[PDB]
């Protein structure tokens, strides 16, 4: 029941259990694909709805963009090793933080 | 699309009680009146006991308009204790304060 639904901020707080995800969407994209005139397509004044080929191609582009998104999450970052991997002994933290007394290191 | 099956079971109870209210009303008065012969009622009895057992206003459970919880409902807003607490504590129900007398 739409009445028993809830905000996503609340669904994740329960899923993660870290106290003991909708960004790739345009403002009018629907499964039915009734591309509107104030949303998606700009404001000729003609209501319309795309076909079975434009829908499938656009949603295929979207799922591929998700896949590349999970790729940019699942790259590898290169950490220089200090005295061994999984150590901290030769790890170079950066330059010291600029002094609030108008200073620099 | 109903919160649960039990809620959907009452929405069915509500509906066919509301449609089957006139027939039951007529024969029932005929029951608790003292004018017709002792035998002239035995017949009307059949009609009632035979009128289906999902419209008798004895099976209506005033449950929760938002989340099916039978016991713990306040009638004036049709809400359970904790849902009414949630809304009145978030401040979207007018007039409801915290009692400090």
């Amino acid at each position: 029941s739409f009445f028993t639904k809830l905000t996503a901020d609340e669904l994740w707080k329960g899923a993660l259990a870290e106290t003991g995800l909708n960004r790739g969407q345009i403002i009018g994209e629907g499964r039915y694909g009734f591309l509107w005139p104030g949303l998606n397509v700009p404001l000729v004044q003609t209501i319309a709805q795309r076909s079975k080929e434009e829908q499938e191609k656009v949603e295929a582009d979207m799922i591929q963009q998700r896949e590349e998104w999970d790729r940019k999450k699942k790259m590898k970052v290169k950490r220089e090793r200090g005295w061994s991997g999984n150590s901290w002994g030769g790890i170079s933290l950066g330059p010291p933080d600029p002094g609030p007394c108008g200073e620099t290191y | 699309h109903y919160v649960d099956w039990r809620m959907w079971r009452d929405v069915k109870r509500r509906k066919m009680a509301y449609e089957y209210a006139d027939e039951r009303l007529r024969i029932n008065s005929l029951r608790k009146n003292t004018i017709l012969p002792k035998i002239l009622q035995d017949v009307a009895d059949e009609e009632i006991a035979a009128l289906p057992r999902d419209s008798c206003p004895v099976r209506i459970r005033n449950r929760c308009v938002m989340t099916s919880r039978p016991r713990g409902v306040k009638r004036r807003w049709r809400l359970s204790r904790i849902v009414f607490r949630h809304l009145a504590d978030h401040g979207q129900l007018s007039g409801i304060q915290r009692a400090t007398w």
């Binding site: 029941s1 739409f2 009018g28 629907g30 499964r31 039915y32 949303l39 | 919160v3």
Partner: protein, 37 residues
């Protein structure tokens, strides 16, 4: 009645005029569950 309510939410989400975060969750979780289950 819960039907006009929830089914209009169904149709308006499928028209893309409504974004419900809850159905986005179940959509996404059921996809990641159909990947393995």
């Amino acid at each position: 009645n819960h039907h006009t309510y929830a089914e209009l939410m169904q149709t308006l989400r499928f028209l893309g005029l409504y974004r419900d975060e809850h159905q986005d969750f179940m959509d996404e979780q059921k996809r990641l569950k159909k990947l393995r289950g």
